Amino acid sequence: MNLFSSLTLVTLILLTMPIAAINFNTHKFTNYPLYVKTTISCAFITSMIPTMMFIHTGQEMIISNWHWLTIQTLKLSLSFKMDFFSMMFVPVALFVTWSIMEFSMWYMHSDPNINQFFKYLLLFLITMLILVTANNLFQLFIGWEGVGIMSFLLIGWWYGRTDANT
Amino acid sequence: AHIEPRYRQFPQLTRSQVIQAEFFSATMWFWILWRFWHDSDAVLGHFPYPDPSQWTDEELGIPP
Amino acid sequence: FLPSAAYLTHQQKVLQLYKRALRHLESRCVHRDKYRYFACLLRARFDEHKNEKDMVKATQLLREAEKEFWHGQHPQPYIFPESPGGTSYERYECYKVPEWCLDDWHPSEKAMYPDYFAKREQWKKLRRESWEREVKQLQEETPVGGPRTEALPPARKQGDLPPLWWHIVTRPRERP
Amino acid sequence: SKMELPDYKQWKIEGTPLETVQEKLAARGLRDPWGRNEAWRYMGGFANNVSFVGALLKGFKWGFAAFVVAVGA
Amino acid sequence: SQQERDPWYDWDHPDLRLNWGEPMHWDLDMYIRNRVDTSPTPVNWNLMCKHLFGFVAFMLFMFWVGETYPTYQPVGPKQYPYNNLYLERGGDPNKEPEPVVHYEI
Amino acid sequence: MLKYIIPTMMLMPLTWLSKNSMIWINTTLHSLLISLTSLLLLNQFGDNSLNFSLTFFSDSLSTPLLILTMWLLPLMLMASQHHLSKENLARKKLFISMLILLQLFLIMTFTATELIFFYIMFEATLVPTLIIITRWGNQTERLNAGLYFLFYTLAGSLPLLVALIYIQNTMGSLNFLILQYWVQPMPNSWSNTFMWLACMMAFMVKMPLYGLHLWLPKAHVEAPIAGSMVLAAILLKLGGYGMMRITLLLNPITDFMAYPFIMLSLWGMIMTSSICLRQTDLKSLIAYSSVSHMALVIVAILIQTPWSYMGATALMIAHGLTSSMLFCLANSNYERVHSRTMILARGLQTLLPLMAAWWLLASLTNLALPPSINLIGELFVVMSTFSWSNITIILMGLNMVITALYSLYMLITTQRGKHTHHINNILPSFTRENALMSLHMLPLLLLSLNPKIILGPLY
Amino acid sequence: DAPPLTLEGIKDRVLYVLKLYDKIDPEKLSVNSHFMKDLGLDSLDQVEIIMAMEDEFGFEIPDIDAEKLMCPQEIVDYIADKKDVYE
Amino acid sequence: SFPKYEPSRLASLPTTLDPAEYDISSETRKAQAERLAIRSRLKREYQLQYNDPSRRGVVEDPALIRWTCARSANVYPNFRPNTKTSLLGALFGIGPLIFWYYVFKTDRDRKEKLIQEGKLDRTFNISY
Amino acid sequence: SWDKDVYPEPPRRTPAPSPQTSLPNPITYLTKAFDLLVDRPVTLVREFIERQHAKNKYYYYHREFRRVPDITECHEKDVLCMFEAEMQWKRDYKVDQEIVNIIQERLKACQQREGESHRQNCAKELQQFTQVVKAYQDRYHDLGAHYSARKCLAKQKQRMLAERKATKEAA
Amino acid sequence: SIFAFTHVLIPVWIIHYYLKYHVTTKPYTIVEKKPRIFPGDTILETGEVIPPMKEFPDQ
Amino acid sequence: MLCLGAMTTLFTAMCALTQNDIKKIIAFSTSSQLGLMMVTIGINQPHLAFLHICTHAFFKAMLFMCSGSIIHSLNDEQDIRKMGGLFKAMPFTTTALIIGSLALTGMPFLTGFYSKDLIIESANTSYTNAWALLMTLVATSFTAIYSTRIIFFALLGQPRFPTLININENNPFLINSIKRLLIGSLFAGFIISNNIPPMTIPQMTMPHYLKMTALTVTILGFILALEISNTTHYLKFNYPSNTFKFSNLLGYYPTIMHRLTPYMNLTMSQKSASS
Amino acid sequence: GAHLARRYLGDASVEPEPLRMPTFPPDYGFPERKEREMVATQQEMNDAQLVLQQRDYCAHYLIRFLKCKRDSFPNFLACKHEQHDWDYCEHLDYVKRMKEFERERRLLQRKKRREQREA
Amino acid sequence: GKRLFIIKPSGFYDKRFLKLLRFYILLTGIPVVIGITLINVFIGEAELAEIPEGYVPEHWEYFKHPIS
């Protein structure tokens, strides 16, 4: 059924609107943690559904679209899958990260640069999701180095303290 | 009222944190007791581990 | 290596070893009561020999103290988590914006904060207002042909503020 | 901002670990610790906190009643 | 020059550990803090390296001692149905079976 | 493409008879018109090139490089004020018309049929950049930089002409199509090796190879910003373009005499990526970065694989964009602190809170972050070289590690952590500088979406 | 992340923890009371005092400043300087 | 109590135990006094360059510019060809190149002769 | 759709579940709610767009060609004969790459459909895949990057000459 | 509330318009490891049973 | 696979003694957990490793969040020293830490029991390498003893931390987050573990001292750490004996490699390249 | 175990080895014993899409178990009796494999024992 | 009397540049996207018909998308 694929794709696509929202904002938000809270909450409640269908049936599937550089005897589209691991891993990471959003609301209450912190953390979430869904190995490499770079920036958040950027 | 510090004395405790502490720890312990009695027998693995396979002879043509 | 002089003293070196050894015992010796015991044992060890009138005996015991201290130091001592070495070490240097800035702002943003900018303008007028005579006369009067020290005396002669003060007073608050 | 500072010599040392170190170091023959500081650490809402197996095994002070309910249901 | 010079002297440059007039050591590109930290080690140097290489070589020696002496429970091979499970190995679906059926114990 | 040539001739005298305070808008607007005009050409379909009476044709070996040059011209130009603003109006017109002439000969060079015309336009590319960097180099050895530049490019490029006249009078005329159609292999004699060595050695000097790369770093540290970007991006990628053109002839002996050049470029790639870790003079780090990437390009060109040529042109276009950008940010920093030295200019996290985002994005494109086209180039070259020798992947990955290391060190050294609290003259960053940033990187990402254009003629 | 401090309160805290000490007296104890000069105690106990101030207030004061304070007023002034507490 | 803690090229010898500090002479105290005076006068000149309201630009450090010009283009003089310089340059320049060139001779000979025979995994080896 | 001769599938199979429970079946409630909330407005959107383009039409045609004879029937030099021959050969190389792309698409389809039942009912596709790719390896592989067409002919002569000489002196 | 579920529903509508039509018209696209029929169950489309597993003994 | 995983597991298990930073203790704990998962792939058993990813994920997410609650509640002093006593003072976060540490080693028998002990049982019932099983057994004992040490030094000691205490949980968000993740650590481990189609053979037939032996080793490790604690109660000050010094400097690996290899390559960049 | 210690501290002749197990052959001295149950219906098991190393004996219980778990989905706890039946069948398989190992041990021990008594 | 004036560098030039950048991508982003939406909601792509018996069409009308 296309329902299964459609809900997996909306659980991917919900993790874009806060980033482009703050990049296109120009009128200052203060409830941006509330915004990230509700979008990750609905992403979790829409990712519990396809795993319920998964254990209800089995029914494993891969999706693929929008191919580019079909140069030689190979080709590659943005192509990612949903078998057992990418089924029963994604709501775990989403649930963990939503609680970490809560704890970062309270813990990082004082720094007035909370918006760029949430931008880095949510972009890191996107890239780790792209790693744990892909079957095209180039996209796995994309997720690999992207979470490396996000780990770099997200450790080196506190500029100064040369131990930390070391 | 807000929160207030104190100097070298035992801090104040509203009873909400202690009731959720009791609730959560003791529901863990109720869970682990209802896990140990009602269903499993997961520490002990439901099957008697046998002796060396039968301790019987004239088994399939043993050589005398 | 210090701004006042070059030699510390024998007493200053003994005392710095005392503070470092006691801090290392703090780091070794949790539950704090055995710490109090061993710390007063250390205090007893240094009051073994209060009556030392000799000098070569004192410095040789000091060198053996450095030996017996390096023989038994601790690898990760409890260093205070705001000091250099510790866990903060300008942790909140995210907002230690230097204060020569806040002068290149747009004038509507300067219209947002009127009275603070009037006060900063009159502080800056005070800064340039009392530079020439006081600081030049003190920095040509009090120095000898070598300055030969780093702590500097104030404007105790006649009037206004002590010299060389702007980037020592107007530092950020260490909680920005 | 007041702090109201619960005042000096209230501690009067009396404490068990500091009393042991005073008696042992006086058996050594010195009688001079720092003394009266850490009685706030050593009495108050402090001072017979639970032992090690008690904090971990704190669970069955409420779990048995609900477990008897679970046996009965 | 850099893990020495404790930062309580309060010189000029807060991180370069320099006070604006010095010979400016020829390896200022590399001897800084955040690149190479030459603190005094708590024990020695030769003692450190010999203990580390001894521990790693001991672990590799016991890895080899483990590799020459495997362990196993008393357990025979599996009993696959279609002659060590043909038709779902490498192939030849109607060409070359090797008939070895299991006999019971 | 004469509809590209004649508006460049009709753009130059307009700047001459432009009035005061009006040179700038006229040149910028009309070069952007040239950019749309350049975008019209992209039509290369299928089996053949797109030809045009004798002189002109277009391939994807030439079309993205041509679009790169004509897109680079307004970016070049708008980098090139505020550091000659107090100079004369006549000298300003002279400089701008010199850059327009240099663009004209570059378009001539990329849209060339014969290799003879390519040689003429090659040293026509050579001549104005000399005058630009030696006049406006703004340091005491811009003299030495221009002189090393001119003598290495002439003294390498010169016997190439004699070999081209020899190919002329041994095979008839020198169209690229006839040389596709009348070529025949020349076996392992000695004179074949000398002719191949002359041609490839001229281009080696232009690359630069590791044996003769002292050419570059003086000419980068001692140049103005327009000539810096032209020199690096268009001259090195023009050298690689010329090698890709000439290597269609003389196939059977490159397996015998390419083994020193591949080795020299690999070990020099490792040594150059190591040498751009520890130097001072912040500008020069990107110079040896360009040396390292063009060494990788050279290995890719000579191991002769279609994957290798696609990755080669991808790496060319990506490194041209990234190095031009990072030179422009280096010029912004030198506008700030008047230093060029690395360890002096520090901080820039409190100060300038979004200029740092462009430094970060540039260093991540240099690092081969995986949507950067740098990574597409490096990835295809790694695939081809592991097919080539199955053990040289270790040098590739060691280059990869060290490349990410020095680029990210260049980021966090000057621009992570503490102002020296004596700089106290930086203004917040101009809209012009940020305009050059978003003119560099927005086409890089919007090319990174659908990058099937920039891959080579072996698509 | 907001405990605030005062001058009078932190001076009362420093005088409190000096009054807590054993072998000095609260009889003649005030803010203008030099340690080595006219309280007679050793420099050794003086550095035990500075150790107590560090161990309570949670920041290392430098070893150059474990030398030349000797009186509670300059102690309160130096702690108020390191913590930057004024209005 | 201990073998007295040798240093190395990496292990820092701290200023606690030299032990050669303790044999102070009068000329060593004179040396420490002159060092203190030199840093005093340099910091005094630094502060007087540093504390004007009319100063806008950089602090104009001569030491950093000295080090950069002494490291960049004042290396080529001075220089002389010794046995040490020539041998070390010939050992670090062409040595590793001829080393990996020999190993690529070996691996290319193996690959050429191997697929010359036909015992390779090129049942499908498409992306040439 | 497409041509189901050239993009085939196995026939579809669906089993009927049977509770054995009385919850009843929350995912059925959710898929009915999905159908009524989503499937009907999407259908109305596509139906409106269907009518709006069902007013008037365009067309496009797949381009076909004639046949130039061969490269072998051109002379020694023939600048204008070899041009037609080699561009015709290069278009064959393009369509042949896309043939290999389609066969690899089929192989991935048989892999993802059959799950863990690989070696039953996928060996036909691996057999035809190694067939077509052995042909491709034999023909278009070892010709370098500056292929025009002529190196393919030289490789062709070399291969059949070596095979002829081997079977002759081993016959 | 209403902002939240229109923020959720308009990507569902857009990507389900995308995932039906263009994705269905591209042939070798979204594909499934098929559901697992059983030797006692039947077929929804064609419809017949598979004969069951055989006799048990020693169960 | 299993040789490298056993090396990591024993290395961090030995390495996590006398580590007075809390976050570094949790780092060595999670590296030992990844050593168990590398041994789990050392057997041909992927899905148990996946289940362990899920349990470990909820587990140390909740554990880091409790640790951050502690550290921000006492002014980011962050160390074991100057933090000693915490029980009966906001028992919600102490409850959180003891639920997390009891789920470490799988106190019998919780969500953390399931993956970890199926891993050790499948490792013991295998054609293993006679060394990796023993190293993982010793490392499970050691993760029991440093879980004991983080409990005992963070919670139950006599309270050592300075005054002016601002220990505060008039806070909805932290209590909701700790609430939800301990609810997750109680149930969701078993919920994920129960209803999956098993892609392996459950061995289920283990001898004497091969099924309860994991619990036996964790309890004797608790005994060993208990007697370490009771010897620490005394007033002795014995010398460090170089296993104590081998454990502080992280087995000397980060120290000596990060002081040696940035000296080698960069000094050769000075000597050969730049000069 | 201790059999491992006996095999590594005695001699490598009398104690058998895994992965080279069938050495003294089947039907060595059988009283016509070979049944080999095989109630799998292996083509139907292909239709059920099982795993390698599960297309084996004691898998019809796995068929019924997957059948009840698929057909009764919100039952988190009901399907366990067929699960235990499957575990009991795999226990019988484990006892079978241990019988095979210790039978080869006893055969090899007694036969080399007898030819050592006669040699 | 508790609150304190935080010291930021500036906001004006940065927010001005990003304001102009978003407005000048938005300036001809709305007409292009709305126009191409009008194209694929009104005019349609094409159909997949074939070359008939004896006819030669243009070198265009071999393409799917109409703006192509």
From Swiss-Prot, chain F:
Electron transport is among the record's keywords: yes
GO biological-process terms attached to the record: electron transport coupled proton transport; mitochondrial electron transport, NADH to ubiquinone; mitochondrial respiratory chain complex I assembly
Its EC number(s): 7.1.1.2
Pfam family, one: Oxidored_q5_N
GO CC annotations, alphabetized: mitochondrial inner membrane; respiratory chain complex I
The reaction(s) this protein catalyses: a ubiquinone + NADH + 5 H(+)(in) = a ubiquinol + NAD(+) + 4 H(+)(out)
Membrane topology listed for this record: Multi-pass membrane protein
Main location: mitochondrion
GO MF term (any one): NADH dehydrogenase (ubiquinone) activity
Spans through the membrane: 22-42, 60-80, 98-118, 147-167, 196-216, 224-244, 256-276, 284-303, 308-330, 351-371, 391-411
InterPro entries (alphabetical): NADH4_N, NADH_Q_OxRdtase_chainM/4, NADH_UbQ_OxRdtase, ND/Mrp_TM
Enzyme class: translocase
UniProt keyword terms in alphabetical order: Electron transport, Membrane, Mitochondrion, Mitochondrion inner membrane, NAD, Respiratory chain, Translocase, Transmembrane, Transmembrane helix, Transport, Ubiquinone
Subcellular location: Mitochondrion inner membrane
Keyword Cell cycle carried by entry: no
Similarity comment: family membership: Belongs to the complex I subunit 4 family.
Subunit structure, interactors included: Core subunit of respiratory chain NADH dehydrogenase (Complex I) which is composed of 45 different subunits.
Function text: Core subunit of the mitochondrial membrane respiratory chain NADH dehydrogenase (Complex I) which catalyzes electron transfer from NADH through the respiratory chain, using ubiquinone as an electron acceptor. Essential for the catalytic activity and assembly of complex I.
Protein name: NADH-ubiquinone oxidoreductase chain 4
Gene this protein is translated from: MT-ND4
UniProtKB/Swiss-Prot annotation, chain K:
Places the protein is found: Mitochondrion inner membrane
Transmembrane segments: 1-16, 25-44, 49-71, 90-110, 137-157, 181-201, 209-229
Family the UniProt entry places it in: Belongs to the complex I subunit 5 family.
Assembly notes: Core subunit of respiratory chain NADH dehydrogenase (Complex I) which is composed of 45 different subunits.
The protein's role, per its UniProt record: Core subunit of the mitochondrial membrane respiratory chain NADH dehydrogenase (Complex I) which catalyzes electron transfer from NADH through the respiratory chain, using ubiquinone as an electron acceptor. Essential for the catalytic activity and assembly of complex I.
Protein name: NADH-ubiquinone oxidoreductase chain 5
Source organism: Ovis aries (Sheep)
Gene symbol of the encoding locus: MT-ND5
